[PDB]
Symmetry: C3
Subunit: 269 residues, 3 copies
């Protein structure tokens, strides 16, 4: 049996303020529903999910969480944005789908602090935020999704990005290139071309082919289209080159979103 | 291999008549498609599913079966209403999804009588009813869904309902509060608040979050949102208090629908 | 990890030409995305999937592949048509859904030639065709879907078709009767009526009930509505009669599509 709780009131919710959603340790957080009003998702900046003071996932703005859910075609409602720790799209290969989905839940056992920090923009009309938690029996943090932010400049022609962090033992579920002039992209590991120079229209067709929604000004490289976690990129230590070849038509700075995965560690990624 | 059969003609289908769909014993009924015309679903009153003369499930009107299917976002077609014994939304935890869904099928082995009784309203224009059965190999009644009806007066303020039947060994998949002025509800068992006083808007958001459709003038407490049968309320013999705290804005009569579950017994619930 | 490749250019793509998509042997083809322009799907005739020179699946026109995907409610996009070897609708009974779906992938190991032949109509405006492959680790051809074409005369009244090929050990996933005047159909094996004389409206309701789309001028007999491969017709070497009783209202020649299934054999069906 799951428990639906109305989280404690968020302290000091005001424009230009730096607030935090301190989660009580002990149980597992499958989903966290954040209700907002008097402020836009884009006005909720620097969203960070921290476990024991260490960064887990980061969102430039709350709007990126809305887009993250939209991509998987999850239920979107105005005035509310959810933090889906449990991945509903997961499919089991040697275990049930339910087990594969719940494995991403935010367990808090052994944790000292679980927080969701963010800053309220100064222009916020009259910010009002509350949260509801869909919890289950306690478990260790364990397997978690680690959304990381990276900013790289793009040229008009070809741009190569090979300096992406490769935490050993971790995996890469997907890579999102946020740019308005990306025509085609190619992904390779150690010379091996896992993703040919696919045109945007072709890449976007495959995405939609798997029930995903194409995000505006974004080139998504989904490594878990089938929902199989073992299809994701395994950051094996012996890997010598993890490269991305981007064919752009504009000279701009792109925001590269990398969805990492791995067993959460006190001293890990 | 399944068998699709055109059930025998329904005897005496006329306005103001009391008809019955007598099902032949021997096999398993996964789904029963009831075609209707010259009558409205609301004109088909007191729908009772009886096994060996005992009541299994009850519907005030056929319209409640239409709403039951609509809630799960099942295919709805005008002129036809189906009895989904097999629950398509079920997900397996230690077994396959298919096994978890088919486990609810209406097995008839060992039964003496299997009937679907109902009364045709007098205002019925020109009632015409036929049925089709989607069957499979015979099995005992076994695990079945037992829809029960309850009527309780709801006040403007706070009302508490703790006298709901607690058949030992049985489970509760969901509870539907049919009232027009329900603002928030709270569910608890033995003091433990499994469902905080959740506002309708918040409760309805979680429901939709799991692919469910919100029913008009209804507050649904779904204990199987994930499709996992083990998330439902297990009516343990030791439970001392099963309470519901309803915050209404109107003084009215609510129809409380309780979806029970358990292994069918000739002398059980 | 899967590999998305831009297949080699299709040789001699012109109106009235006979082209072929020669697939490199070694890996497994889960899906093949065929992009087309300057030609209609109906202008791409006699589509044949050949393994070692032998016929596996056949499509009168590329439009039949579009309808095949539409029926399962797969993502349809103008200018592109995919060959879904892996069946996304598959559900596991004693194995995971993923295993049951991927089991249909087009493995090429041990093969000498893998081709997708077709003829470009003479009326083609300015045909332009390219292909992309979603591949995975190599496997033998193994379990494959074998779409077969049959033409039979339907009468206005009742027609019976009992001369359908019954390859031993193979299965039948579905049968599609392409005719404009089919009212009802009945399916039986050895006298046993597995599908009663179901009216089109009733048959089509069950189809939609399982997330399928009804095709125009087609009576589909889906034996895998639940996604369970074990629900399909097992062509037992002991079946004496496999009959189809069609109640038509027109006198026309129907195109009977039979989706066979079985482990591909160099000297088999
Ligand atoms: Ca976890
Ligand atoms: Ca049962
Ligand atoms: Ca295969």
């Amino acid at each position: 049996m799951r428990s639906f709780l109305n989280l404690n009131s968020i302290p000091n919710v005001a424009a230009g303020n730096s607030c935090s959603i301190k989660l009580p340790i002990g149980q597992t957080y499958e989903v966290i529903d954040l209700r907002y009003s008097g402020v836009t998702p884009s006005q909720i900046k620097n969203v960070r999910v921290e476990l024991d003071g260490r960064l887990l996932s980061t969102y430039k703005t709350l709007n990126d969480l809305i887009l993250e859910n939209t991509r998987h075609k999850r239920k979107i409602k105005a005035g509310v944005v959810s933090f889906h720790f449990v991945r509903p799209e997961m499919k089991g290969v040697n275990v049930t789908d339910l087990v594969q989905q719940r494995m991403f839940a935010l367990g808090t056992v052994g944790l000292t602090t679980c927080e969701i920090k963010f800053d309220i923009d100064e222009a916020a009309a009259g910010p009002k935020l509350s949260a509801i938690a869909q919890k289950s029996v306690g478990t260790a943090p364990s397997w978690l999704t680690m959304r990381r932010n990276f900013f790289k400049q793009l040229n008009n022609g070809t741009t190569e990005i090979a300096d992406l962090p490769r935490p050993v033992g971790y995996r890469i579920a997907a890579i999102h290139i946020k740019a308005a002039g990306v025509d085609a992209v190619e992904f390779q590991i150690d010379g091996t071309k896992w993703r040919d120079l696919l045109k945007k229209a072709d890449n976007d067709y495959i995405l939609e082919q798997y029930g995903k929604a194409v995000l505006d000004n974004t080139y998504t490289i989904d490594f878990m289209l089938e929902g199989d976690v073992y299809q994701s990129v395994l950051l094996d230590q012996m890997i010598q080159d993890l490269r991305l070849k981007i064919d752009s038509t504009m000279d701009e700075q792109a925001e590269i979103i990398v969805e990492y995965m791995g067993v959460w560690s006190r001293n890990g990624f």
